[PDB]
Every structure is written in structure tokens, then in C-alpha cells.
Design a protein around this ligand. Sequence first.
Ligand SMILES: OC[C@H]1O[C@@H](O[C@H]2[C@H](O)[C@@H](O)[C@H](O)O[C@@H]2CO)[C@H](O)[C@@H](O)[C@@H]1O
Ligand SMILES: [Mg+2]
Length: 552
Amino acid sequence: LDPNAQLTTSLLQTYGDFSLMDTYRNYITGFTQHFAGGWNVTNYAGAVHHEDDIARRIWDRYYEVAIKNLVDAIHKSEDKANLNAALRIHRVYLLSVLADTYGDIPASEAGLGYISGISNPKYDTVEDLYGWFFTELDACEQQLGTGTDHISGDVTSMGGDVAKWKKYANSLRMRYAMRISDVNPSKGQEEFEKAMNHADGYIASAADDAYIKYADSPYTYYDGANDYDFRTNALGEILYGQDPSSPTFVSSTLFYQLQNTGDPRLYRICRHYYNIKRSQVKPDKEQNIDLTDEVLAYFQRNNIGEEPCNTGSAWYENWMNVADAAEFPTLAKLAEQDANSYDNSDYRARLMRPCLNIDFEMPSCPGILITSAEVDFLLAEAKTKGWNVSGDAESHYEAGVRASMEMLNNYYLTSNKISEDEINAFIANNQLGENPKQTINTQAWILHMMNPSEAWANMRRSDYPALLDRSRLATFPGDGFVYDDPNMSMPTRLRYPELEGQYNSVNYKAAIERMGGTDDWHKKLWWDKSDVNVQGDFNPPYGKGYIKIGSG
Ligand SMILES: OC[C@H]1O[C@@H](O[C@H]2[C@H](O)[C@@H](O)[C@H](O)O[C@@H]2CO)[C@H](O)[C@@H](O)[C@@H]1O
Ligand SMILES: [Mg+2]
């Protein structure tokens, strides 16, 4: 009821609501090809399988909680200009996620009547929404600091500092100006330069990174869905999984991007776990038994190597030979003590695959809004476009790579931090090269691994990184997965919630007619001009690659 408390709830929901995270585990982080091998991502993204109850969650949960709270608090804060501006900025942020997910969405008519359930809003067009983002963020950025009120509900890294909220608003303007740079290059350039030249500045260093701060509190997964306090980061929670036999595995797309470039992030992101006794309350190092070094030593002894799971395949598909516990001295000692716990062959099978480091799965992980590393990559790309940016593209790109590594050191890694020498060597071996747009946006995709909505939006916009071509990778109908969409390319949006067809029937129909007459998750959004690039060949040294030509 207090508008600062409504700001708090709406900020925390962003990453703190487990009941929308199935959309991120099952679809979006699979679409981006960061993760593959878990059952959930294989069944949904991996099979290009639409299910309304999964696809609808970002829409239903953000409109039911955050948008209702924000709209109510905005109406009730006209006397508190600083809070009012912060509420409106977070509303822009969430509406941009909603529009980048679904396309045309309720916004301009999503007011007091709509959140009370008595009014049907039209769906604003993506083009009109993006235009409004620029005017609203300009207005909010100037309104910040014209109040004397304390933004006491701020749970972000901005810590109620209006100067930091101003830099955040200008950085969002820069992101959205890049987003529209293919469909409207002149507006993109104008808006980008206006924001980057603004007297109040943008996020230029990690000290001004914008993220939501989450607490070290126990995980509860789907339990108590009615009573969510949103205090912990539910993205890392769902990636850890409610089921120890289905943790999140790193895809071959991400694995080979890292390995092929000598990226020191390879075995910071990827670890090998034997996790049968792991805590579900809070990921623990004691029983997420990290056997990475011993697994790599076994590979070296046997002239073999990693088999990261391909997009479309589960860990139990494209079966990788399972080493005996005797191959890993730590596990061998444990199994000689207690075979029921430590000689389980299913848990040893999952030990063979590269797993996401539990450092990315802890309750207190930050919820990234926008980082200085992203802004560095935006400046690098703007320079390559010929926009009026200070400093050469190489300098901005190198700043972005360095800041992406330091982000891991500062926000995630609890051990084995990436050294300055490792960063400098990686940068020296990975310059912009012949296709700077590809290099910049592939590095940004690594940066956005824990910010899946931005990863997916920027990949759709820039069409990089080149993904694995799903149509050239195996399917597994004999394993119970359903392949009901003959177009296997990565979806470019999600379908609208099907209940909208009843609950807001006229406006749902009109939005669907505008995209050509069916609710098509292969239809590109207004700012998405071209198809994402795909890798022309994939023949990994171990495991399975593209199916052999002519065998399909
Ligand atoms: O056990 C079946 C299935 O459950 C999935 O979680 C459900 C959850 O039980 C339900 O309360 C919620 O409303 O929906 C989610 C998503 O369907 C779980 O994610 C799956 O791993 C599991 O196969
Ligand atoms: Mg595209």
C-alpha cells in the first residue's frame, strides 16, 4: 500500500519470482543456446515445443504483480517526484522485457482500470512502445532529483542515489537505441548520441552497474507460491533445479565458443559435479562435489575429451561413456566408504557433462539490469557504425571484455578468480578482426548469460552469435519428446497467453491480425530485421555434431 514498498516488490519480482522462471529455464536460456542437457530445456526449447502454461508466465506474473504495483504506485506518488521517476523507469524496463518477449503488449492503456480488472487495454505496437521508451526515459531522467523524497524502497545497487538512477536511465536509452538501429538507423543514432552525451552521464564503470540485490536466504522452489517474498534470485534457483538429477548443463554452443577462443571463463562457467547429497536449501560446496580437475585428468589419460550436450539433446541422449568411480580418486575414496551414495551410475553419468558452476546459482546472486560491460559493447558497435563516439572501436570492445571478466570476479566467483594476466592474454588473442559486429555481439552474448532476456533480444537484433542450426541436430522422438512444429528454427518471440483470446478477445484478435493472422512464434518483431546466423559446420572432436549430410 505504501508506494516505496510497491517499488520494492516490483524490483524484487524481476528475478525473484520462481513462478515465472520456468519460461527462462524451459525456453529462453535454451533459445540463446547457453544451456542444454537438462530435461526441462530439452522438452521445451530443444523440441521447439509450445506449451501455454510455460510460455505465458512472464506475461501473467509481471502483469499480475509488478505492473499492478507500479501503476498503482505511480498514480499515488505525484507528490514524491524521485520515487515517481524510479517507479516509471522500472515500468519502462519491465515493459521492454514484455514487448521483447511477446511483441505488441498492453502499456499505454494498462492503467488503473486494467489493473483492477475492469478495463480491456489495446496492445500497443512495438514501434510505438519503443518511441515511448525514449520519451518516458528522457522525462524520468530529468525528473530525478527534482523531489526531496528518499527512494527508501530501492533494493538495487543504485541505493536510492538519484545520480545513479539518471545514469541507469541514460544507459537504457542507449540499449534501446541500439535495439532499433536496423529498423530505424537515424532514430537509433539520434537517441544513442543524445543519451551518451547527456550531462548526467551513463554507466561508464562497474561502480555504476545497475542490478537488483538479492539475499542469502533459503530456496523454496515451487513451495508456497502464494507467499513469495521475492527476496532470493530465482533464476539461479531454477538453474540449480528443484531436482538434483536435473541440474543445468552448459550447451556445446557455449562450451565451444569458450574453448575455441581460449576463453579463461571456460572452467569458471563449466564444472563437473557429483551432487547426490547436495543441499536444496542453499547450494553447498561440500556435496556439490567438484571433480572438474579429476575429470579433466581422466580425459587426458584416455585421449578423450568433453562432450557438452547439444541443443535439442538431454544428458542421457548422445550417450557419453561413463567412467568408473575409480577414475576419480576423490570419488573413488568416497565410493569405497559408501557405495550407495558415491558409486551411483546415474549420478556418475551426469558427472561426465559440463555443469553450470553453482556460483551462478546462489540465492544472493545479483539480478542484472544493465552493466558497464554492456555499455562498452554498445559504444564499440556504435563506433563501427560510424556514429559520433569518442575512442576507437577496439578500445571500447577491450573495455567490454575486461569488464565482463571482472563482473564474474566481482559478482559471482567464490574461488579461482580470473587473473589480470588471463584477461590480457585472452584479449590479445581475440581482437575485433574482420567482422567486428560478430566479435562484439558474441562477447556480449557471453556477458548476458545470466540476463537471458537481454541475451535473447540482442541476439535477435544483431543476429550473432552464430548458433548451432537446430534443423541439423538430432531429434529424439523415441525418448518421448514431441516435435510438433515443423519449423525448427529458434523462435523469435513467444506466443500470447491463450486466455487473452477470451479475456481481452478483441485486442488479442487485432494484434494477431497485425502479425499476419496467426500467433506465430517464428514471426520477427519490428526491430528484428533478419534471421539469426547459424554455424555452417559442426564436427566436434568428441561426441556428436551435425547429422551427416544426406542421412536426415
Ligand atoms: O513433476 C512434473 C513437472 O513439474 C514441473 O513443475 C511444475 C510445478 O509442479 C507446478 O506446480 C507449476 O505450476 O508448473 C511447473 C511447470 O510445469 C517441473 O518443472 C518439471 O521438472 C516436472 O517434470
Ligand atoms: Mg534477427
